[PDB]
Design a protein around this ligand. Structure first.
Ligand SMILES: [Zn+2]
Ligand SMILES: [Zn+2]
Ligand SMILES: [Zn+2]
Ligand SMILES: [Zn+2]
Lengths: 343, 7, 333, 334, 340, 7
């Protein structure tokens, strides 16, 4: 069995030794002689080589080679050579490097993506962006669920839409834009907006529901109730004005649900509150929408792909746009929950 | 000791 | 002068009083009587109203009405009626919520010129947000063709487009989206420093190209000597990076803060391809676009002034590296 | 298999023989012949050596050498050469001295999450120990602002920080000190039992907020039902207190071992209560709390406060332990 | 002639009667009637009140009031009303209930601190922790003595240091950090390591020397000899691996000194090599314990409101079992150093 | 304890 050095690894002389790899897996090795040995060993695996065929090629002690080989293999800097057959004319080539860097066999991850079915419940700015990431990452089946028409004020965040698309159904437009980008995948549309809780029975079972429609106010509560009963994974994403929000990612039997961590009367002011709130329109900002959409999609890809833990497991995550700030809200499982208890 | 902690 | 309640204000009974606003400016008012007075006050401004008319209309004590009015004014929950009004309608809500006059912001965007230096994943996303936000002129600079592998991160590109100039395809998709803007293409990759003189002066340069492996250093030196604002955005594998935003004389710049081993490293690094991942690409690009919009709009401080900001994707993490001005930096001062 | 003499070993001539070791493992060897045989044996392992090779190197009988060897090995005065492998270097000697492999302990810390429920005197001191020891994720929970009065014992805070949120400033200061870790903040004070649901699952919760007076009773009850390990620390005026370290299914809980006009008067007096805070007392509670957390997660030594509430006096030379073992009749558990 | 109930007093229904006070002074009163009377009495002093004014609001006979009053007074559960004449906003006010509970006037303790001078000899782990406590409690002048620079391994115990401070002198960084926390005090630094005994003459006179420097092995023997000759008070603090150690606090003419209770060629070579390789198994919790209790003794020694623990004692606190022990270090008239 | 302090 051959191993091969991942193309996503880089190396720098730093401090006393150097750095190996880049991004989150980047390792600072303080020992010069160790760092030096790691690169001599790495170099032996540029070409797909079994441990000893690569060993017969280096000029360091056999036991020293093992330490360095252990470091490289554990950090996924070298990988099984089988992991490296994407046709090279394979569209998902750059995605394959991602999967490899997490220690996964990218062909198996890709196949899970191919076999998955994702419901996009809401086709606004978040649905737009999530659906396109998913299509181009090769999710095999996407069901678009929205009954809204395109408006000109939409064009600021809703990335798939042209000026000429104003007036069309969002779902019809998303679908053609998706099939322009990946003709291999399957897209269907349901002309529906959830207004009853019973409307949710019209939503088909899928690997996951991506829930972004904010109307009505308690859409998420119905979605959550329905999905806990139906054993149906979902992820929520959205924004509150300038804050981008994603999570929780609900996984039946595994995570907490939306309700786990959850425990006016004067009529003259109750009416004032309801008018003020009826007039509400979010201070939409495309960068906010997009960060929310992007992280939601990453978690969908990880959830289906299985090669890394999604970030929004047991958490609702808020990213601020006018400060450097991420804050999570606890949505871990409560044994006293009124929705997902079931025991 | 015999009494509870302040914080 | 009239005031009006912003459409972005939401109100909720909460705790011992209630919430007023949403997002970063969300305010928790512990006192119920106060919160109820703020509501009565805000209701007076649903349609534009002067301070005196609303004092009469809200039937509450002057000392209480004045406190609630100042509260709402200070948080830009009510704003001058003159700031109220449209394809950028929603953006206007955003600018209003920072206490800007949105017409004046929009005018600044309409009259700006932005260089997109690199038209891969980051440039794609940034250019589309800038275009749909109303930046008046966009100059795309890249000489690469579209490849099938591009389609995972490069949102503007279709299958029919593999083979064509990146710059070409970006331009027509930007113009299908916002026709009111003007898009220039410059068929150029920066293979020597001298090349930068071809990149035109602009309000800002967005610098996204990761070719070669020393480009930001060249760009830094040029924009320093040429009094040219720029912003960097990229990724290191699974980490999204944006910043710093360099402002001539106002901020810091990028440079403020054995043999047989050597050919081995050089070779390995020569084989490097980044582990790209669209969600990461999109995060870096979105936050870069926000900073560009803030820089030219002037309504809020861009996040990456004096900072290089990383966002991780395998964990919940933002981190900024200090890049404030150095008295003894080689490059500036 | 190489063995090596740990660097924390110390030897001195004393009484009839001498001392081998330093600290709690220090041993008085009365027999001078045996003491000398121990040192001649230790000497063969100053640089790492296999048993057989050191035996040939030492000029003492196979019988004595085996014995002195086992003496050194069982006291972790000599350790496997592999344990000898840096930021965490002095912690490394600490783990070695307990017979642990430092890198394996360090990996357990790296992989742990700790909730710091309360970001005053104790939280300040606990969180900085945990962060610089390499605890991987720390969750800071407090809704308080820093006051000029905090500075006496809230060591991470400065006059320039007066007015900012404690969580925000702790995070900055923890990250200045170890950029390798992750720190989270939750802007929350526990003013009702219900608020404990906002506090996430962790390896252990470090509980130390002065108010509400019955916060530890709410925490105890929440943690038993949630199966959440927690440790309490604080003080009763001049007495430093830490413990119990509650471990689901394993220890007792905080509740296990324990007139009209008067109750009114008692209630009034007690409601005016302010603790006689003193940084030394705070820092002692916090340090020994943090030691129990590191031991609890690192699994190299028994935490002291398992089943125990421990008081260290500051005006007397005195430590006293109260037994908090499981009770079948406990109102919360059992 | 007003008395006030201290805020630090708590009472508890417990056992047959109940508890009065919290901490070292906690008293269990077995008799429910007497304890109820102590409550009724304490309640009369919630507001600043003379004995007779308080008595006037008591509903108990005078003999019982009088006994309960004397009980509260002797334990400092009630204190002179003027001892409470701070501002709740004074930077040092937290500590003030601490002083009150020992029967001291906080204003006066605080004045003693503000006028004191403390030499910190050794700016490692112990020095870091002692000096911030001392700085934030209001010791008026702190002189920091160390020639070492900050490395990366320091960061486990050396609380005032950050990653950014690596390469810098310990004294400069400590000074920057102490003045950030308390800009009302004075901090000076001397760039010195005690290499020879003679070097000790370069260390200034002060109220007390806090001695925790890292090298040589016999630094305390030097410091002891010097301080005995110079009539200089000092406190030693440190650790022996997992045991936190503080004491003795040496007071000229009053306490014993360090040397007071001091009781083969090849083998000796081996010992000497083994001992030259020695490096302590440092651990922040142990460091922090030793430093805290050292600082406590320094504050009491200068503030004068309670007796330092380590007078005539070297005190050990174990970290892997529940154990404190003291070593007798009282005066020997026969001592080689401070004797005859 | 029976040996001198490290620092
Ligand atoms: Zn639930
Ligand atoms: Zn510069
Ligand atoms: Zn119990
Ligand atoms: Zn003596």
């Amino acid at each position: 069995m051959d191993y091969i050095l991942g193309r996503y690894v880089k190396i720098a002389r730093y401090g006393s030794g150097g750095l190996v790899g880049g991004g989150g897996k980047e390792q600072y090795v303080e020992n010069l002689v160790l760092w030096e040995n790691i690169i001599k060993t790495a170099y032996c695996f540029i070409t797909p080589s079994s441990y000893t065929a690569a060993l017969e090629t280096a000029n360091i002690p056999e036991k020293d080679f093992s330490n360095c080989f252990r470091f490289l293999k554990e950090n996924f800097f070298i990988i099984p050579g089988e992991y490296n057959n994407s046709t090279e004319n394979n569209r998902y080539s750059r995605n394959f490097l991602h999967y490899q860097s997490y220690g996964a066999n990218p062909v198996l991850v890709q196949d899970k993506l191919k076999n998955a079915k994702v419901v996009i419940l809401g086709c606004g700015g978040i649905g737009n962006h999530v659906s396109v990431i998913l299509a181009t990452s090769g999710i095999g089946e996407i069901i678009l669920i929205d009954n809204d028409q395109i408006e000109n004020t939409n064009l600021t965040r809703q990335v798939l839409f042209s000026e000429d698309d104003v007036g069309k159904n969002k779902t019809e437009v998303i679908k053609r834009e998706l099939l322009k980008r990946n003709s291999e995948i399957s897209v269907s549309e349901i002309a529906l907006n959830i207004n009853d809780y019973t409307d949710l029975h019209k939503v088909p079972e899928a690997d996951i529901w991506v829930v972004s429609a904010d109307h009505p106010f308690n859409l998420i509560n119905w979605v959550n109730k329905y999905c806990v009963r139906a054993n149906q994974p979902y992820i929520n994403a959205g924004y509150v004005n300038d804050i981008a929000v994603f999570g929780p990612l609900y996984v039946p039997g595994k995570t907490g649900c939306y309700e786990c961590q959850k425990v006016s009367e004067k009529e003259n002011i109750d009416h004032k509150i309801k008018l003020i709130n009826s007039r509400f329109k979010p201070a939409t900002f495309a960068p906010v929408n997009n960060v929310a959409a992007a992280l939601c999609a990453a978690d969908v890809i990880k959830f289906i792909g299985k090669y890394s833990e999604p970030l929004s497991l047991n958490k609702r995550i808020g990213i601020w746009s006018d400060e450097i700030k991420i804050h999570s809200q606890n949505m871990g499982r409560s044994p006293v929950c009124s929705v997902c208890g079931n025991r | 000791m015999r009494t509870g902690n302040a914080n």
